[PDB]
Amino acid sequence: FDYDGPLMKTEVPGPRSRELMKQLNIIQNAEAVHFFCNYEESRGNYLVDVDGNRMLDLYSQISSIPIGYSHPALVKLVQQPQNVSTFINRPALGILPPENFVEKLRESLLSVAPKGMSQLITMACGSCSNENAFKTIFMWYRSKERGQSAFSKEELETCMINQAPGCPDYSILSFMGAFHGRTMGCLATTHSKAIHKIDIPSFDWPIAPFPRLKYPLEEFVKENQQEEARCLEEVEDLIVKYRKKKKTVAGIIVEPIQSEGGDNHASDDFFRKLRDISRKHGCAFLVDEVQTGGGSTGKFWAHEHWGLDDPADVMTFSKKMMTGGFFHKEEFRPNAPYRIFNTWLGDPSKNLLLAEVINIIKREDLLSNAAHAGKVLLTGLLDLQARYPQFISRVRGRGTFCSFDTPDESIRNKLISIARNKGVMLGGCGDKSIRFRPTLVFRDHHAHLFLNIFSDILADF
Amino acid sequence: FDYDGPLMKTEVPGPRSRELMKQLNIIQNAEAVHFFCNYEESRGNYLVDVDGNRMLDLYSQISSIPIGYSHPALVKLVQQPQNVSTFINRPALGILPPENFVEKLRESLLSVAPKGMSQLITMACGSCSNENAFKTIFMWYRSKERGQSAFSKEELETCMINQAPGCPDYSILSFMGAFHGRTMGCLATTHSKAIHKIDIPSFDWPIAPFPRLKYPLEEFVKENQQEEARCLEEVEDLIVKYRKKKKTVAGIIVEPIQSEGGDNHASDDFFRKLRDISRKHGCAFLVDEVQTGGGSTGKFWAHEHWGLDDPADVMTFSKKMMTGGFFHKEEFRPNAPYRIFNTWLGDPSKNLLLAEVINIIKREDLLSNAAHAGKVLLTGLLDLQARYPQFISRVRGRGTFCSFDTPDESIRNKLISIARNKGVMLGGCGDKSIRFRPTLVFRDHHAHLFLNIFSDILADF
Numbered sequence: 001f002d003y004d005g006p007l008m009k010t011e012v013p014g015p016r017s018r019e020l021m022k023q024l025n026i027i028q029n030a031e032a033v034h035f036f037c038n039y040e041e042s043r044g045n046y047l048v049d050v051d052g053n054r055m056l057d058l059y060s061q062i063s064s065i066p067i068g069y070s071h072p073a074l075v076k077l078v079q080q081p082q083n084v085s086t087f088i089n090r091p092a093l094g095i096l097p098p099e100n101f102v103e104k105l106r107e108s109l110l111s112v113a114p115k116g117m118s119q120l121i122t123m124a125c126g127s128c129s130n131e132n133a134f135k136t137i138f139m140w141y142r143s144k145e146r147g148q149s150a151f152s153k154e155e156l157e158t159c160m161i162n163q164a165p166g167c168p169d170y171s172i173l174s175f176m177g178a179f180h181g182r183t184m185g186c187l188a189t190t191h192s193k194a195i196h197k198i199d200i201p202s203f204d205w206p207i208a209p210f211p212r213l214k215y216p217l218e219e220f221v222k223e224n225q226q227e228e229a230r231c232l233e234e235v236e237d238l239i240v241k242y243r244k245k246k247k248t249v250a251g252i253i254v255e256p257i258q259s260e261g262g263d264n265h266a267s268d269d270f271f272r273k274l275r276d277i278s279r280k281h282g283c284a285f286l287v288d289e290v291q292t293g294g295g296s297t298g299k300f301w302a303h304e305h306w307g308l309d310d311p312a313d314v315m316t317f318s319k320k321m322m323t324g325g326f327f328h329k330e331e332f333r334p335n336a337p338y339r340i341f342n343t344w345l346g347d348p349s350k351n352l353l354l355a356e357v358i359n360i361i362k363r364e365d366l367l368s369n370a371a372h373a374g375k376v377l378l379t380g381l382l383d384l385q386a387r388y389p390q391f392i393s394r395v396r397g398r399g400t401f402c403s404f405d406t407p408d409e410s411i412r413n414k415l416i417s418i419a420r421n422k423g424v425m426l427g428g429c430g431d432k433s434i435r436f437r438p439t440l441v442f443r444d445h446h447a448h449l450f451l452n453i454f455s456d457i458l459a460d461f
Numbered sequence: 462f463d464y465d466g467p468l469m470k471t472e473v474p475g476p477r478s479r480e481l482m483k484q485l486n487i488i489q490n491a492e493a494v495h496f497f498c499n500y501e502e503s504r505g506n507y508l509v510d511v512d513g514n515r516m517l518d519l520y521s522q523i524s525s526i527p528i529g530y531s532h533p534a535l536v537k538l539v540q541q542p543q544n545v546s547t548f549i550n551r552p553a554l555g556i557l558p559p560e561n562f563v564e565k566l567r568e569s570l571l572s573v574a575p576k577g578m579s580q581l582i583t584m585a586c587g588s589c590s591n592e593n594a595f596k597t598i599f600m601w602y603r604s605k606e607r608g609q610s611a612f613s614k615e616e617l618e619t620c621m622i623n624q625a626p627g628c629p630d631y632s633i634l635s636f637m638g639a640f641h642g643r644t645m646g647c648l649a650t651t652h653s654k655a656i657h658k659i660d661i662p663s664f665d666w667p668i669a670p671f672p673r674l675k676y677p678l679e680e681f682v683k684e685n686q687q688e689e690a691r692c693l694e695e696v697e698d699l700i701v702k703y704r705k706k707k708k709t710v711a712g713i714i715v716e717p718i719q720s721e722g723g724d725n726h727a728s729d730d731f732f733r734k735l736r737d738i739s740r741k742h743g744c745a746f747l748v749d750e751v752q753t754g755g756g757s758t759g760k761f762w763a764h765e766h767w768g769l770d771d772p773a774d775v776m777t778f779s780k781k782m783m784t785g786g787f788f789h790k791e792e793f794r795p796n797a798p799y800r801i802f803n804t805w806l807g808d809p810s811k812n813l814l815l816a817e818v819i820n821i822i823k824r825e826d827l828l829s830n831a832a833h834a835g836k837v838l839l840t841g842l843l844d845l846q847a848r849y850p851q852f853i854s855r856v857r858g859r860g861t862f863c864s865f866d867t868p869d870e871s872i873r874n875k876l877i878s879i880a881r882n883k884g885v886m887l888g889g890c891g892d893k894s895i896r897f898r899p900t901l902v903f904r905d906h907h908a909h910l911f912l913n914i915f916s917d918i919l920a921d922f
C-alpha cells in the first residue's frame with residue numbers, strides 16, 4: 001500500500017513543524033530536527049509531515065524502516081489480540097524469556113543467519129550490538145590466551161578497579177571514515193565527523209585508512225587496486241605495531257560500505273583480503289551491518305557479495321532489523337553468563353514485527369527488487385552525472401545503497417533542501433555526499449519518479 | 462486485576478522450561494535463564510511460567526515492570542486503533558519526531574522532572590542513558606574550560622584519531638559496588654562483580670568507597686557517621702589526585718541506593734554532602750536512578766528523599782520508566798546537534814505506555830502505597846531477622862526497595878531456589894544478599910503472603 005506520488009502544500013519545515021520545533025527546543029537542542037511527522041498518514045515510501053506535505057522518502061529514518069510506513073501486514077499484527085502481551089509485558093530477556101522466544105527467533109533472525117555463525121545474541125540498538133561484540137571479542141581473545149583455565153586471583157582483583165591484567169589493554173582496529181555508534185566504546189571506532197567525536201575521551205586504538213576509490217571505476221582499475229593494497233598493507237602494519245605496544249588488536253571492525261562517513265565503497269576482493277589478514281593475526285573479524293544489513297544492497301547482508309564461506313567471526317545489525325544483535329561463531333560464545341548481558345537485550349515486540357518483515361521480504365522478493373530498482377536508480381544517476389558534471393561526481397552504489405558527491409558542503413545542503421521542498425527526502429553523508437536509503441518497497445517507478453524531479457531540479461539549478 | 466495467590470504445579474524450572482532452555486542453549490549461552498514465561502497469562506504481581514506455575518513476583522524483570530503484568534489500562538492502549546502507527550512506524554526521533562512527541566512527553570517524563578532540571582533527552586535503555594550522560598558531562602566540562610573560544614584546529618584534527626586534546630583524558634568518578642551498565646563506558650564506572658568486568662578494557666578513572674552501614678542503624682550511629690565521613694573524604698582526595706594526574710574528574714556518578722552490587726544504602730546526609738563536594742570541585746553530579754527511579758522508594762525519584770532544591774546536574778533513568786533518557790540542567794545542554802545522538806533515541810511506543818503508567822501511579826496513589834507496603838514488608842523482615850539470626854542479617858530498605866544478607870552465597874542461592882518452588886520469585890544481589898523489587902501494585906497483603914511462605918521455608922531449612 002503506497003501513494004501515487006508526492007504532494008507539497010508548504011515549504012519544509014512548514015508552519016506547524018516550526019511551531020513544534022520551537023516547543024521541543026525548550027526541552028532539548030532541536031537543531032537536528034528536519035520536521036515533525038504524521039506517521040498515521042504516512043504509507044509505504046511516503047512520509048507525511050504535520051503541514052500536510054507528502055514526500056517520497058529516500059532516507060527512511062536513517063535507513064531503519066524496512067518495508068515502508070504503516071505496512072498493512074504490520075498493522076494486522078498489532079490488531080491481533082494475542083499480541084497485546086508482547087507489547088505491554090517487556091521481559092528481562094536474559095533471565096525470563098517468553099515461551100515463544102526461540103520460535104520467534106527461528107521465524108526471524110535465525111532464518112537469515114550469516115554463513116558459519118550459529119550463535120545469536122539480541123540487543124536493542126546498533127551501539128549496544130557493537131559494544132557487546134567488542135566485549136565478546138575481548139573475552140574470546142583472553143579465553144584463547146588463558147586456555148581452559150580458571151581466572152587468576154590477580155585478574156579477579158584488578159578487574160574491579162579498572163586495572164590490568166584483569167582489564168587488558170587490548171584494542172579494536174577501526175577505519176577512518178567509519179561509523180559504529182556513539183557510546184564511548186563504539187565512538188573510539190567511529191571516525192565519521194569531528195563534531196561526533198570532539199571533547200569525548202577515547203581509546204588509543206589503531207586507525208587504518210579505508211580505500212578512497214577513484215571514479216569512474218573502469219578508468220581507474222590499477223589505481224584502485226593499488227589504493228586497496230596500500231590500505232591492506234597499512235592495516236597489517238598497524239596490527240603488528242600495536243602488538244609491540246602491548247595493545248594487542250583483538251578484533252577488526254569494518255562496514256561493508258562506510259555510511260555516515262561518506263558512502264565509501266571497496267571491492268569484494270578488498271574485504272576478502274582484509275578477512276584473511278584478520279585471521280592471519282588472530283584478530284576477530286567484526287562486520288558492522290547495522291546500516292548495510294536488511295537487503296538494500298540486493299542481498300540480505302551486504303557481506304554476502306564477498307562470496308565467502310567464512311565471511312566473519314561476528315556480525316552486528318540493527319536499524320532495518322527493528323531489533324539489534326549480533327551473529328557469531330560458536331567459538332565466540334561467552335564461557336559464563338552475566339558477561340554479555342543487560343536488562344532487556346532487545347524487545348520481543350520488535351522480534352514479532354521483524355518475523356513478519358522477513359516474511360514479506362522473502363514472499364515479495366524484495367532483495368531482487370532492491371537490486372533492480374537500485375540498478376534503475378544508479379543508471380539515472382550516471383546519466384545526471386554526465387549531464388551535470390559541475391554538480392555531480394563519483395556516482396556510486398550497490399543495490400539502492402547509492403550516492404554521489406557534490407562540489408562542496410553548501411551545495412550538498414542546498415540540493416537536499418530543494419529536493420525536500422520538491423517532494424523528495426534525501427540524506428547527506430560525509431562532507432559533501434548525497435546518499436540514498438530507500439525502504440525495501442521502493443520500486444523502479446519510484447526511482448523514475450525521483451530521477452524526474454531531480455532532473456528538473458538540476459536544470460533549474 | 463490480580464490473582465489471589467501463587468499456585469505451583471512443578472519444580473521451577475519445570476519440564477517445558479527445561480525443554481525451551483535446551484533449545485535456546487544451542488543458539489546462545491542460556492545459563493542465566495531462570496525459566497520461560499507465559500506473559501499472556503501473567504497478571505498484576507503474578508508471573509506465570511510455561512509449566513503453569515504461578516509465582517508472586519518480587520523481582521519484576523529486574524525492577525523494570527512498573528504496574529504489574531498485563532495491566533488493563535495498558536491493554537486498552539494497544540487496543541486503540543489510533544495507536545497502531547506508534548507501534549509500527551518507529552522514527553529516528555532526533556530528526557523526524559511525531560506530531561505528538563512534545564505533548565506525550567508533557568504527559569509523561571516532563572510531569573515528573575526532578576528539581577532544577579529543565580532539559581530532557583530520551584534513550585532506549587539505562588546504559589545509553591549513562592553513556593550519553595557521560596558525554597554530556599565531558600562536553601560541558603570542556604565548554605567551561607574553553608569558554609567563548611571556538612574549537613581549536615588541533616582539537617578538531619586530533620579528535621578524529623582518538624587523541625588529546627581533541628579527545629580529552631577526563632574521568633568520571635564512580636564507587637565500589639556500583640552498577641551503571643555494561644557498555645564500555647558505563648562498565649568503567651561499574652564495580653559490581655568480577656564476572657561483569659573481567660577481560661574487558663577499561664578506563665583509569667577514580668574509584669571511591671561507597672559507605673558500608675553497620676546494622677542495626679540505631680546501634681551504630683557514630684560508626685556509620687564516621688564511615689560516611691571517611692568515604693566523603695576519600696572521594697575528595699581522589700578528585701584532587703586525578704586533577705594532578707591530568708585525568709580531571711568531570712563528573713561523579715552514584716546510585717541513590719547501590720543495586721546489583723548489594724543494595725548498599727547511605728544516609729541522605731551522605732548524598733547531600735557528596736553533592737556539595739561535586740559542586741565544590743566543578744564536577745557534574747550524575748545520579749543514576751535507572752533502578753531506584755519509578756517510585757518503589759516511596760518517592761518517584763529516590764533522590765527526592767534528600768530534600769534538595771539542586772539535587773543533581775544530570776539524572777538518568779530507565780527500567781520502570783519504559784524508556785530511558787536523562788534530565789539535566791539547562792547549562793548541560795549540548796551547544797550543537799549531532800553530539801548527543803543516535804538513530805532512535807528511545808521509542809514513542811514506550812512513551813505512549815509510560816504516560817499511562819504515570820497516570821496510574823498518580824490516580825492509584827502508588828508512591829504512598831510503596832512506602833506503606835514497603836513498611837509492612839520491612840517490619841516482617843525485621844521480625845524474621847529476630848527469629849532467624851543464623852540465616853538473616855542486615856535487614857534494610859526504603860519503600861519496597863528492601864533486602865537482607867545471608868551467611869554465604871550458597872545459602873543465598875538455596876533460599877532463592879526454595880522460595881521460587883514455593884511460589885515466590887526473589888532476586889539476589891552482591892555475594893550473599895537477597896533483594897526485593899516488587900512492582901508498584903504490590904500491596905501489604907502480598908508482603909504478608911510472602912512473609913508467611915518464607916517463614917515456613919526458614920522453619921524447616
Ligand SMILES: *Cc1c(COP(=O)(O)O)cnc(C)c1O
Nearest residue numbers: 125126127180181290291803804
Ligand atoms: C547507525 C549505525 C550504528 C549505530 O546504531 P544506533 O542504533 O544508532 O546506536 C552502528 N553502525 C552503523 C554502521 C550504523 O549506521
Ligand SMILES: *Cc1c(COP(=O)(O)O)cnc(C)c1O
Nearest residue numbers: 342343586587588641642751752
Ligand atoms: C539496570 C541498570 C543500568 C543499566 O540499564 P540497562 O537497561 O540494563 O542498560 C544502569 N544503572 C543502574 C543503576 C541499573 O540498575
Ligand code: FES
Nearest residue numbers: 124128585586589
Ligand atoms: S545502548 Fe543500545 S538500547 Fe541503549
